[PDB]
Amino acid sequence: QVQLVESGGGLVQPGESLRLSCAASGSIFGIYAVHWFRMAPGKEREFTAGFGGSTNYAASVKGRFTMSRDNAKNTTYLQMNSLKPADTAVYYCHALIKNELGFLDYWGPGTQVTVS
């Protein structure tokens, strides 16, 4: 039973740099992929950052986005820089992990960051 805890999410001004840490509380056999998704006002279910194998990010923010996959501490890091009001979003975690109970996909509760 993997539990995803999001940390580092806070309301910030445009142009700021923020990190979201999605710590995996439950024990794991191994990780395949973990993907960030955005709920932004006027924006649907969309792919923030993840892989695609090699690390992949979204359009117009690929340089701003930075993925730090850590297989030792079991916490993934997302760095978004030069923030804009369009980046006001709930960043939902989604980790595809095979663990003790079994292969599963787990969705993080997500954190909302407001930019204006």
Partner: protein
Amino acid sequence: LCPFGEVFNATRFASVYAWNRKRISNCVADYSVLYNSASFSTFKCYGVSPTKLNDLCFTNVYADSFVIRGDEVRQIAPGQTGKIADYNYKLPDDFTGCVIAWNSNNLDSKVGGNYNYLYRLFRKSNLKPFERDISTEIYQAGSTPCNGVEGFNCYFPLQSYGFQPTNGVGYQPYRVVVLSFELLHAPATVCGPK
């Protein structure tokens, strides 16, 4: 008696794009639960007759659990060119496996919507039978590729299930487990209850 029931009683099933495979062996298999209907929907069980299953002996059984909308439950069948087959989960052309589908709209659906599950509808090529595809690589409906998954040029293959409670039976989500059966020179693990 290996736990064929636990998959029926698992807390939550796998997504469409990523299907978890459990193989059961060195155990006696009971089809009594399958003699009873999974839900109001009668399961389609290919190959050998459902009433004859207790006599069958399989070298290995592979169980896959996933949740799908009621409309696409008919789509899953041995070897048909379909969206789930081409991009989500492919079954060989002529297969004897047994499909069990039971409605779970009440438990699964959320008023706010549970997007725990996605499907793939986009791919340049065809899906071989029984290979789980977790690739998130950029897809291009248009001919020209783009870097950075630009919207109007490149369209993401994965899209989520809303699972808002809907009266339409096609949208209602069913929990479905498929039982792949294979035979080879090795002795069959499956045994009859009596």
